[PDB]
């Protein structure tokens, strides 16, 4: 149900996005970003160190992550 | 430390 994109990087960060199904997507906060405890609570499963660092407003069901290289 | 924290395989 939850889609996990492939990772790409720049000289500084690695990047991924996560696409949520409609039922999980409706829980995503609008007024803050999610700490790792919070997105793991939601059911998002990935490695350690990924930071939900911005809200992509046009598509709330898509979560943008980055982690230092 | 049970349950592995990693991305699910494709």
């Amino acid at each position: 149900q939850i889609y996990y994109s492939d990772k790409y990087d720049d000289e500084e960060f690695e990047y991924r996005h996560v696409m949520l199904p409609k039922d999980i997507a409706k829980l995503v906060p609008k007024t803050h970003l999610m700490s790792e405890s919070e997105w793991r609570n939601l059911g998002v499963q990935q490695s350690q160190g990924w930071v939900h660092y911005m809200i992509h407003e046009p598509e709330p069901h898509i979560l943008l992550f980055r982690r230092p290289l | 430390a049970g349950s592995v924290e990693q991305t699910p395989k494709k």
Partner: protein, 325 residues
């Protein structure tokens, strides 16, 4: 009809009905209208969420006497080129903005009156954290996801904030066991809400012991992702006579059965234990502890300025009058 005779207070009364861009428009009418458009009484509450702006501008707006400044997810990715005198700001949210360490330092070095602050998601430094210690009246402080500072800077900050009620000090990714130990040994005894999640191996059972010993008034305690905490630490929570909200998600070495003990805490209302209840058993836990709400709060409210009800533009309950909507 001459409106030039109309007193200052009455023009301020008319101006106060104008939305932000409308207010800036009318400053270009005369030297008097320009004076009054920047008054004070008009600039108490300001919301610039998501705004891309030069930090000199934000410094200027703050110098006009802003008391509550909502500016999360903003862009201030240019260097400061102006100097400022102390700000009156008491409530400020800059979380998840794009802003350099030096710019952040420039702004915060002029702040001593903060009651509520969120710097969630921002890279800091020792000078920043040290300058934050000027705000000794801080009641709510959010440094979740912040980094770039030593345990020595943290200690000074925590020792200064001796009336702190809510502290979110979670997921500070560059923390070592020194930071964690400083945190539990230096948080104000007054603290009723602590989020210290995300330290895994760097948070030990003895740290919980220190905390409980020092901070008997805890109502919310979030220790999610603390692998070292098992059922042998549970008696520590019974020393907290006011504990209502506990979180122990992904404390993987907790045997699901042992969570029954936490049902004996007389004041407990809610429990988060995500990731440690085997699939197909959660409703057993729930029905076994029916006086508790279990796994119903994915998110922390600790030192968070703005939560829930899908719109919410309030900053710790304050609606901002000047906004770009």
């Amino acid at each position: 009809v001459s409106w030039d005779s109309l007193p200052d207070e009455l023009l301020l009364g008319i101006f106060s009905c104008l939305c932000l861009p409308e207010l800036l428009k009318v400053s270009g009418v005369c030297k008097r209208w320009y004076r009054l458009a920047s008054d004070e009484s008009l600039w108490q509450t300001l919301d610039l969420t998501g705004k891309n702006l030069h930090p000199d501008v934000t410094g200027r707006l703050l110098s006009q006497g802003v008391i509550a400044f909502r500016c999360p997810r903003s862009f201030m990715d240019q260097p400061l080129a102006e100097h400022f005198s102390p700000f009156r700001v008491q409530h400020m949210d800059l979380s998840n903005s794009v802003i350099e360490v030096s710019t952040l330092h420039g702004i915060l070095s002029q702040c001593s009156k903060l009651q509520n602050l969120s710097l969630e998601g921002l890279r800091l430094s020792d000078p920043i954290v040290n300058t934050l210690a000027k705000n000794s009246n801080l009641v709510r402080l959010n440094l979740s996801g912040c980094s770039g500072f030593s345990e020595f800077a943290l200690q000074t900050l925590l020792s200064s904030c001796s009336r702190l009620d809510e502290l979110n000090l979670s997921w500070c990714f560059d923390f070592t066991e020194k930071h964690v130990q400083v945190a539990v040994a230096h948080v104000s005894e007054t603290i009723t809400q602590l989020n210290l999640s995300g330290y895994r191996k760097n948070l030990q059972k003895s740290d919980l012991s220190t905390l409980v010993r020092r901070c008997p008034n805890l109502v919310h305690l979030d220790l999610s992702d603390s692998v070292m905490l098992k059922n042998d630490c549970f008696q520590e929570f019974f020393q907290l006579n006011y504990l209502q909200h506990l979180s122990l998600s992904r404390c993987y070495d907790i045997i699901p059965e042992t969570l029954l003990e936490l049902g004996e805490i007389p004041t407990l209302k809610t429990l988060q234990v995500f990731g440690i209840v085997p699939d197909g058993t959660l409703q057993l836990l729930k029905e076994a502890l029916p006086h508790l709400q279990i796994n119903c709060s994915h998110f922390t409210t600790i030192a968070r300025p703005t939560i829930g009800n899908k719109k919410n533009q309030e900053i710790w309950g304050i609606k901002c009058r000047l906004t770009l909507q």
